[PDB]
RNA sequence: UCGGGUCUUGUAAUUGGAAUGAGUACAAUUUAAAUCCCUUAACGAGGAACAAUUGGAGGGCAAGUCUGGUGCCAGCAGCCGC
RNA sequence: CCCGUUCGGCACCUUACGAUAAAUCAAAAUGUUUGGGCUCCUGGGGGAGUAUGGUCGCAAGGCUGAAACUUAAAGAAAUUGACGGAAGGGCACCACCAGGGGUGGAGCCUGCGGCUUAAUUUGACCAACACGGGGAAACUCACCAGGUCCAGACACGAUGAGGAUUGACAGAUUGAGAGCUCUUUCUUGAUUUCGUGGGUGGUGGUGCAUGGCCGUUCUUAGUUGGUGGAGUGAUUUGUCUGCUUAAUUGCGAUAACGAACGAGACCUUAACCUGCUAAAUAGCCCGUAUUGCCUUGGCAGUACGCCGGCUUCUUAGAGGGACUAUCGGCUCAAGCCGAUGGAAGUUUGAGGCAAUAACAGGUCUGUGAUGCCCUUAGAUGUUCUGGGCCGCACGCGCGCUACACUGACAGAGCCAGCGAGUACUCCCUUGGCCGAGAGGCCCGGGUAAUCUUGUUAAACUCUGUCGUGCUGGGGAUAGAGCAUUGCAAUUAUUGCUCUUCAACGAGGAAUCCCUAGUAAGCGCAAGUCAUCAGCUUGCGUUGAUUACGUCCCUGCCCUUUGUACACACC
């Protein structure tokens, strides 16, 4: 649903224990995600919440990347077309 | 660790239970047979009192219920 | 050694019941899960899509109005 | 557009219609004598009746991520298992 | 001896039109499109080549050969991991070479074990032990000997205003003016008390039930889709022989081509700008008044200017500048080294963040994050008095002072940077006065580039005393006295004054950290803090020997290889 709303990438992680002896964790991912530098500090929005259940406590972690441009990317402007002409000419 | 045994040697501590008093306020008057009603125990200095203030006259030492007027009368 | 000789009481570590607790690990169920995800997704989106586009105060103070006989 | 009509289906909503034997019983028939069957006078359906059961609901195998109880106990399960 | 043809043998290399589950096979082919001829053997795994019978043999034994009973898997080939006391390659001063400075030797500060005590609270055994920001006089504090209070919500039934329920003077009583209790009676009056149910709290247990966070693997270079090729399939190639780089960073060879995380880029900070915008809470020039000397006309200082002029130095904003630039020898290339220029040529120096995936790593003593169990009124709730965590025959770890002449002692000369500071509180403190010293009194400035502060720090430099002797090097142990912080200093808080003058001559077997403004020496500020630093986090001063490497030791990762393991050598 995140990417239907137009997101460049997302990642949700859930962990804890609810109906088993030991803890279990899952992680689902799609799209792109950066992790290292200050671009990762600002582009990503994160949040973390607890939830209490009859048997215990579950931890939720959500990250969302919204697509002023990353320093690594480089864009080259298309060359403009021109046509050769005969050497002589005149004007006013 | 572990929780060791405890023996509180003193038997028990029992609070000051109030002895019963069955309307001892009616003793506090002396009515003159369908006339005026003179009073019994006199009053105290009553800078912050003045009504019904009785004085614990027992043995040569007295006090007020609120003012705590310790006076050695002898 | 902290692994092989568990030092707690075995208490209902049933993977079968956990499958119900977490997610069944079968291909057939996932297709139904995807259909349900599609159904839930639309309703949440549409709500966002639709959304996006007798005076007595004086009497409180007035309590000293009532008066009584002098002396 | 809470709109109108044409066909089919169902109604923890109301009624309205005709019919029949399971039983039961005058007669005759059946038969060595009877019984049963096949005909047939007089009776025989509106709910708590004239009231259908045996096995199942994780997979092989068709059909509930119900609700109360128990807590490796009682138990279930041809096999994998709970 | 050479070349060639042919018959019959022991073998081999490439390939699959063919076969098989695959490993592989010129037969293991010509088989679901099934028949050339003939002999022998097996029917899930054990019991079992056992018992009994027969037969051969001097014997050991050979040949033939069952059943009762038990069980849901044993087994073959190949794939991915894990592991190995297997091999080959690479990387690293938590590895070594070349070295510097050290510890382990003594005294002391401080943590751990153990011993002992009424208690000496407790967490942890490279990645625990100067750690829990843990430098505890009470408080902190969870322990011991004692004493108080309920804040035990609400609902139900009863006592009850012909009185539920509260507080108290004095005397006794206890460390205790705790009404804690005991003698007697005044005061307040429906909120309380009794019992039942039901809650609340807890530094109480479980980190082997969890969340969150952190540490380690891991400062290393590693991890994946899409289309295509191989395989019936799990999978595999891409992701590699070689060279290069700090790097799966690149060049290349190639059944692969083009991409995505990580690394790089990114951000903070240190070095350059006589060019821009500047500044009395920063400076210089200039101009007045003025002091001292030479005198000259100057030199060295003081006070003022607020539309006198300026921004080199100090300070912050926008930008520029280094990109390996030019060269000379290697070399396909990527590069490496060396000289010149330049403030800067190791990624210019140093940091921050930091991939897929794990650990029964640590924390319930951070949390009103949290399950279950336990305790609840003689409390494991909270609170007050005293103590202890520091008690000591002895083993171990992080540090401090010294073993002196490259020194000690006495005068004098005299240079920083990072930071911090007072409202309902008591901070940083200048100046004047008293005081041998520690300290004391009286005005005042600063909520701050304005005052403390130029923080005149220490090291260091010049002139002398001492002179090889454990001596004037050394400062452990103790006695006496004087103050400060604090309610309180005994088991001495610390400081000051006089005396007392221990061990220790470069430290065995072992072993650590480190490559340039670095090691090492020396001090300063901040954190905890009323006082206490031998501790940590930062700052500056002086300032070197040795190398520009290798896999010999000790770790780690990649490939080949083996496996009866896959909860994976616990």
């Amino acid at each position: 649903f995140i990417m239907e709303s137009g997101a460049k990438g997302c990642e949700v992680v859930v962990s804890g224990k609810l109906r088993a002896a030991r803890a279990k964790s899952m992680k689902f991912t799609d799209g792109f995600m950066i992790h290292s530098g200050q671009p990762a500090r600002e582009f990503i929005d994160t949040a973390t919440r607890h939830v209490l259940l009859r048997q215990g406590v579950l931890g939720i972690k959500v990250k969302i990347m919204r697509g002023k441009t990353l320093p690594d990317v480089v864009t080259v402007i298309e060359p403009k077309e021109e046509t050769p002409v005969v050497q002589p000419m005149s004007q006013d | 660790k572990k929780r060791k045994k405890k023996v509180y040697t003193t038997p028990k501590k029992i609070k000051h239970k109030r002895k019963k008093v069955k309307l001892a306020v009616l003793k506090y008057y002396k009515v003159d047979s369908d006339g005026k009603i003179e009073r019994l125990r006199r009053e105290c200095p009553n800078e912050s009192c003045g009504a019904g203030v009785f004085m614990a006259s027992m043995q040569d030492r007295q006090y007020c219920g609120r003012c705590h007027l310790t006076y050695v009368f002898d | 050694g902290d692994r092989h000789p568990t030092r707690s009481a075995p208490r209902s570590n049933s993977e079968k019941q956990a499958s119900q607790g977490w997610g069944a690990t079968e291909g057939e169920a996932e297709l139904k899960d995807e259909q349900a995800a599609e159904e839930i997704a639309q309703t949440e989106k549409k709500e966002a899509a639709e959304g996006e586009a007798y005076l007595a105060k004086l009497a409180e103070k007035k309590l000293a109005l009532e008066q009584e006989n002098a002396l």
Side-chain angles (χ1 to χ4, degrees):
Chain A
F1 181 76
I2 302 299
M3 304 177 144
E4 300 311 347
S5 296
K8 187 251 174 176
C10 65
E11 182 179 1
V12 62
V13 190
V14 190
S15 64
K17 173 261 296 179
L18 72 165
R19 315 204 195 173
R22 298 265 287 300
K24 266 272 192 283
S25 78
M26 293 180 183
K27 178 176 78 173
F28 313 102
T29 61
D30 60 356
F32 293 98
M33 185 65 72
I34 72 186
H35 288 162
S36 295
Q38 185 162 57
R41 181 184 285 166
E42 70 90 14
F43 278 119
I44 294 90
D45 189 358
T46 183
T48 304
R49 255 75 189 156
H50 316 279
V51 56
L52 72 165
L53 278 298
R54 286 87 178 270
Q55 189 275 331
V57 164
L58 283 158
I60 305 103
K61 174 174 202 54
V62 183
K63 300 200 293 181
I64 298 295
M65 184 180 288
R66 58 93 170 174
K68 158 63 179 43
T69 314
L70 281 71
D72 63 358
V73 72
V74 64
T75 296
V76 176
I77 301 285
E78 294 294 328
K80 197 34 183 162
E81 181 54 20
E82 269 93 5
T83 291
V85 69
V86 76
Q87 69 280 16
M89 185 66 204
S90 81
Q91 291 295 327
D92 184 15
Chain B
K1 298 195 171 185
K2 181 75 176 179
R3 301 309 193 98
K4 297 296 289 177
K5 182 64 70 179
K6 173 251 188 175
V7 183
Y8 182 74
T9 60
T10 298
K12 274 311 198 201
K13 258 293 184 178
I14 297 91
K15 64 182 182 293
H16 304 297
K17 180 67 174 63
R18 56 212 184 172
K19 181 266 290 180
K20 187 44 210 182
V21 295
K22 189 199 179 125
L23 270 65
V25 71
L26 277 296
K27 192 65 45 155
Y28 292 165
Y29 291 172
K30 294 292 180 68
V31 58
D32 188 74
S33 169
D34 291 331
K36 67 182 290 294
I37 295 91
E38 59 92 23
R39 190 177 178 179
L40 286 189
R41 277 144 70 170
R42 67 184 191 97
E43 300 84 3
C44 63
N46 295 111
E47 69 294 340
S48 77
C49 294
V53 292
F54 298 105
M55 191 45 90
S57 50
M58 295 179 178
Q59 294 82 17
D60 308 315
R61 165 268 299 157
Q62 278 67 236
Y63 85 112
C64 171
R66 303 84 170 290
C67 308
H68 298 89
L69 294 174
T70 300
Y71 275 141
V72 176
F73 288 97
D74 285 325
Chain C
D2 53 270
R3 196 49 203 88
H4 67 280
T6 70
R7 297 206 284 88
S8 298
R11 81 159 67 265
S12 86
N13 189 359
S14 77
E15 273 82 3
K16 175 264 286 187
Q17 190 286 335
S19 68
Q20 188 274 330
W22 285 103
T25 191
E26 66 157 358
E28 288 79 2
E30 291 188 333
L31 183 63
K32 324 173 73 178
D33 293 331
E34 294 293 328
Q35 312 309 108
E38 187 43 79
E39 290 296 2
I40 63 171
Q42 295 298 109
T43 187
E44 187 65 26
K45 182 175 174 66
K46 65 182 181 181
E47 296 184 15
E50 276 152 21
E52 72 156 3
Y54 183 72
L55 73 164
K57 296 183 290 294
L58 277 296
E60 189 46 54
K61 300 289 92 180
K62 294 293 183 181
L63 294 174
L65 284 183
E66 190 276 332
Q67 191 69 21
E68 184 67 25
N69 278 350
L71 200 165

